[PDB]
Symmetry: C2
Subunit: 71 residues, 2 copies
């Protein structure tokens, strides 16, 4: 069972929820952090600046569990 998928390819950040509850997504790039919400069975798409596509961090919080992906 694929629960969480995170893909970063040329600026585009693709965080995907495969759980039964919504998850919070925090994207840290360029020294700033933004929070997003992706519902169950839904895929989130965020774009990165050209000067931050290779120095980003994606943090997904589902329930009380945290998953972090740093580039």
């Amino acid at each position: 069972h694929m629960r969480i998928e995170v893909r970063v390819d040329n600026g585009r950040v693709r965080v995907r929820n495969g759980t039964d509850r919504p998850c919070r997504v925090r994207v840290t790039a360029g020294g700033e952090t933004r929070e997003y919400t992706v519902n169950p069975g839904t895929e989130l798409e965020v774009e990165l600046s050209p000067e931050q596509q290779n120095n980003a961090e994606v943090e997904v919080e589902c329930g009380n569990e945290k998953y972090r992906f740093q580039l």
Copy 2:
């Protein structure tokens, strides 16, 4: 609580197991697939080829749950 942490930096892949059970890690880059077992509370460190540091996939299997992280 941090369950899984994946870091890719200039070819160095780091996977930390924050769970209570061992997890299976599959690293695919440039058509080559390597698999590892990471014990709870431990961090796995792998090195990538210079031609595949910007194109890699890290797949973590913790029991029945699968987690995929993709660069590129």
